[PDB]
Structure formats: C-alpha cells, structure tokens
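Notebook entry, cofactor series.
This is the third protein in the set we're modelling with a bound small molecule. For this one the ligand is potassium ion. I'm keeping the input format identical across the series so the outputs can be compared line by line later. Sequence and SMILES below, as received.
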Amino acid sequence: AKAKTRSSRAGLQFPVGRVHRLLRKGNYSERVGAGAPVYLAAVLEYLTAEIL
DNA sequence: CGTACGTGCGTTTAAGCGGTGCTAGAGCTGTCTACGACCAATTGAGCGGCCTCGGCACCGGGATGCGTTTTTTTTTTCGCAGCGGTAC
Ligand SMILES: [Cl-]
Ligand SMILES: [K+]
Ligand SMILES: [K+]
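Returned structure with ligand:
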C-alpha cells in the first residue's frame, strides 16, 4: 500500500520515474532496463549540480 | 638582409611481399532465467492560480583611478665662446 518514489530509492532529486517514461515514449528502444532511468537521472542531477 | 628550406646524389633502412605455422577469439547454436512489458487500481507528486516583500535596476552625487595635454624638470648630448696650463 505505501509507495516510495524510485528517485528516493536511489537518493536522487531527479525523477527516475519521468526519465523511465520519457525513454519508453522517446522511441529510443523497444525495451528499457529498470536501472537505466536511475543511471540517467543520476548523471543528469550530477551535471545539473556541477554547473549550479 | 639573413637564413631556412628545396633539390639531388649518395648511404642506411626496413617496408613490402608471399608464404608458412599456431591459436585467440568471433560469432553461431540451443537451453532456461531473469527481467521487463502489460494491466489494473490506487495514490500523492507536480502543475497552474493567487498573493507578498526583497533583490535588483535605477538614479543622482561624490570618489578613485586612468588618459590626455602640456608644463617643469632631469638627464643626456652637442656646439660656441670662454677658460688655465703649454711653449717659447
Ligand atoms: Cl537496467
Ligand atoms: K575470428
Ligand atoms: K536473463
């Protein structure tokens, strides 16, 4: 019943959920692994901080 | 005006070739596992309205430093007449 947001499970502020959707609806591939969005929201957050 | 390329002829090298010998590693087949797509339902994260108050652009009014001229000086750099010692 209690739904923790994946972004929390990675300790990322970047939305690992919205990254997963954007990828599947991006037409990048047929199938997205479940680590991929994590890995990507991570890298995104990181470069966001590096500039900020 | 100075010099560092360019040509070319002469030595040094090692690339290229064709063939031979050994073996990693490419790249396929079959099997089976784990992982991810799909669905449904349930949520709260995230978005479009409101309503401040404070960070920012502004403004005018001196203050610091930066460039221009042009005035006064310091240092160097010839040139003319006015010396002190030779010479006799
Ligand atoms: Cl993955
Ligand atoms: K091979
Ligand atoms: K597998």
